[PDB]
Design a protein around this ligand. Structure first.
Ligand code: ZN
Ligand code: ZN
Ligand code: ZN
Length: 123
């Protein structure tokens, strides 16, 4: 139930600003809500499946503000600056035993869903 990328991908380079406000994993196709908090596209869509919702991150961080801290489709946008930054980070496959290495973007487009440890049962 974790849409975001396993924190294992970044390893020691793991940073808080690269994490989804919802699943707490590395941002996957990030959107930025009106309040500034980032969410994986999948995570935000799920949260907003039944309409607007209060931003849990705003609450927990004690900065909740009426109106601005409300997650809404009309005020959330693709955070391409965040996406580009995260895609440029050095990454290693999360599969315990895999040696694949490259940028997170290369992981998403070339390795994810094509991992030997996951697809080859006799590995
Ligand atoms: Zn997420
Ligand atoms: Zn927020
Ligand atoms: Zn792998």
């Amino acid at each position: 139930l974790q849409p975001g990328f396993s924190k294992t991908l970044l390893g020691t380079k793991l940073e808080a600003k690269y994490l989804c406000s919802a699943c707490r994993n590395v941002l996957r196709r990030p959107f930025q809500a009106q309040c500034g908090h980032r969410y994986c596209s999948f995570c935000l869509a799920s949260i907003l499946s039944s309409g607007p919702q209060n931003c849990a991150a705003c609450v927990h961080e004690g900065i909740y503000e009426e109106g601005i801290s409300i997650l809404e489709s009309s005020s959330a946008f693709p955070d391409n600056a965040a996406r580009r930054e995260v895609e440029s980070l050095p990454a290693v496959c999360p599969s315990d035993g895999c040696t694949w290495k490259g940028t997170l973007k290369e992981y998403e487009s070339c390795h994810e869903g094509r991992c030997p440890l996951m697809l080859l049962e006799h590995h």
